[PDB]
């Protein structure tokens, strides 16, 4: 009943109660959405070698017996997600010394799956996905020290109380390429918690390429204490999107906006990209990003930013890309974008901008891409764009442009001479003709 096409055997939702007899040369097998109640050593007796095995979402209670995978010396990826009340015997993964990827998402597993000996045989393991289980504390046993190629751990949607130095002791010395700790709440780590000093640095002697901490609230006081706690950790990309508690927002809230102290612990982290999108930041305070001295990309998209104080971008001598889309900016002036001499891409789309100051883009001699579409601009000052000599792409459409003469004379003439750069074409309100085509008498 399985569909066999070359080396792939697709057995999704076939009402199977055991591994069927199939040709012995296949290297990809998908057994998802069946009613297999137990896998044992006889389950994969004939399907040797094998590189990719999927058994997701069986009927509740799948049991994986000792030595189930012994002999599968070619197996690289083993996916077992969405098996409710998954029962693993302690030798369930015996023989998988070459496995690199294991996914055990939504299996009602708890912290003992990391502290017990379940994963001790997986000496070549590189990527472990444990999303959406019941792991309340992250306490890897010591054998993780010898998993020399372990570099990806995903614990998203586990109700983790807190992460501390002693918890992660057996991750020390490691370089993670991706450590995804998204939407785990960290409920205990509030400003009043007595455990902060004992907590130490959870990421001690550990470097991380992409640190994903999205969806965790991250009240300003918490971000400050957390990054102070992990001070010195080398992080290339920091993801803090969906921090619903970070900004103080439009309108009376109880939370504070970040300031020049919030991210101080990351001064020596070498962060290259930072994602703070989909939060509730209302004002950019002075030197709030002054500790990101290596940062190359910064997105603040989809916040509630209404105000940008002076020197908000202080210290960003290397910043190349700034995304400010979907906020509530009211007017742009020359002061707002100081300290961004090297900026090349600026996204100001989907805002509420009604005015551009005379010298708004003065300090951006290297600017290549400027998006200003979907705002409320009716006119621009003469010469506002004449010094952007490196400019390659500009968005000005979906604005209620006032195309009266001679007010529109500069913009209409400028857009025509530079017609190859305009993205989406800016249109006059009312007549709808391209601004680039208007020639004032």
């Amino acid at each position: 009943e399985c569909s066999v096409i070359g080396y792939n055997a697709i057995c999704i939702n076939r009402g199977l109660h055991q591994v069927p007899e199939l040709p012995a040369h296949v290297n990809y097998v998908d057994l998802s959405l069946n009613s297999i109640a137990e896998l044992n050593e006889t389950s994969f007796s004939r399907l040797q070698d094998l590189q990719f095995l999927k058994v997701e979402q069986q009927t509740p209670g799948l049991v994986i017996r000792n030595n189930t995978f012994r002999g599968l010396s070619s197996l690289i990826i083993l996916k077992l997600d969405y098996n409710q009340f998954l029962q693993l015997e302690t030798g369930a993964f015996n023989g998988l010394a070459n496995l690199e990827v294991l996914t055990l998402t939504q299996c009602n597993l708890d912290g003992a799956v990391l502290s017990g000996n379940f994963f001790k045989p997986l000496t070549s393991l590189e990527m472990l996905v444990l999303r959406d289980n019941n792991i309340k504390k992250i306490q890897p046993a010591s054998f993780f020290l010898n998993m020399r190629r372990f570099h990806v751990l995903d614990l998203t949607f586990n109700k983790v109380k807190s992460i501390c130095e002693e918890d992660l002791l057996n991750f020390q010395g490691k370089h993670f390429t991706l450590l995804r700790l998204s939407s785990i709440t960290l409920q205990d780590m509030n400003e009043y918690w007595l455990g902060w000093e004992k907590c130490g640095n959870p990421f001690k002697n550990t470097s991380i390429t992409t640190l994903d901490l999205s969806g965790n609230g991250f009240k300003e006081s918490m971000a400050k204490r957390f990054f102070d706690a992990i001070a010195g950790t080398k992080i290339q990309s920091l993801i803090l999107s969906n921090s619903y508690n970070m900004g103080s927002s439009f309108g009376h809230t109880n939370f504070k906006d970040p300031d020049n102290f919030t991210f101080k612990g990351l001064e020596a982290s070498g962060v290259k990209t930072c994602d703070l999108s989909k939060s509730k930041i209302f004002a950019l305070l002075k030197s709030v990003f002054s500790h990101f001295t290596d940062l190359e990309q910064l997105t603040l998209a989809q916040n509630e930013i209404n105000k940008i104080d002076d020197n908000a971008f202080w210290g960003l001598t290397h910043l190349l890309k700034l995304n400010l889309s979907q906020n509530f900016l009211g007017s742009i002036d020359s002061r707002m974008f100081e300290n961004l001499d090297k900026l090349e891409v600026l996204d100001l789309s989907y805002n509420h901008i009604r005015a551009l100051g005379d010298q708004s883009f003065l300090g951006l001699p290297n600017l290549k891409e400027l998006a200003l579409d979907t705002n409320q601009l009716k006119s621009v000052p003469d010469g506002i764009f004449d010094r952007l000599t490196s400019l390659q792409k500009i968005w000005l459409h979906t604005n209620p442009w006032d195309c009266s003469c001679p007010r529109i004379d500069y913009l209409s003439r400028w857009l025509n001479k530079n017609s190859q750069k305009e993205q989406g074409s800016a249109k006059c309100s009312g007549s709808g003709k391209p601004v680039r085509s208007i020639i004032c008498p």
Partner: protein, 166 residues
């Protein structure tokens, strides 16, 4: 989310080719199938390679690493790629190549090294310059010394010094 079949979700796979190019990647994806013969990793933001990243990819015939931000290479990173014929590393941030890095690449026929800031004042350059002198026909374009334009192939031991190695 992580895998579309056996292909890493960030990449596109066809036959034995795995295309991870132009996907704003900061690191090499995990779970690349061991049958991969062609691996595209060009035009990303990869700043380092972890030791052994390619150790399992014994079938690789082409490795495209150009247009990244690599600042050094780990020792032994190519040692298991004995079928490798194409190795493209132009437009990166490399200052030297670790001693013996290409020793095992007996099937190599095309190598790109240009547009890197090779640090020829520093004696670490000497493995590469000697290697280029013995395998001149393989290079596409000309790797050149930073700040002097002098091809790497022409480096003499007299011109180098251990003390000029920051």
């Amino acid at each position: 989310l992580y895998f579309q079949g056996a292909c890493p979700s960030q990449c596109s796979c066809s036959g034995t080719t795995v295309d991870c190019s132009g996907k704003s990647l900061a690191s090499v994806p995990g779970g690349i199938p061991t049958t991969t013969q062609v691996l595209y990793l060009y035009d990303n933001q990869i700043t380092k390679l972890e030791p052994g990243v390619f150790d399992r990819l014994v079938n690789l015939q082409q490795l495209w690493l150009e247009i990244n931000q690599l600042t050094s290479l780990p020792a032994g990173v190519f040692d298991n790629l004995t079928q490798l014929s194409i190795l493209n590393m132009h437009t990166n941030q490399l200052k030297s190549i670790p001693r013996g890095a290409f020793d095992n690449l007996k099937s190599l026929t095309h190598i790109w090294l240009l547009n890197n800031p090779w640090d020829c004042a520093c004696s670490d350059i000497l493995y590469l310059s000697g290697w280029l002198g013995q395998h001149a026909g393989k290079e596409q374009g000309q790797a050149v010394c930073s700040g002097t334009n002098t091809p790497v192939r022409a480096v003499t031991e007299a011109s180098t010094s251990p003390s000029k190695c920051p």
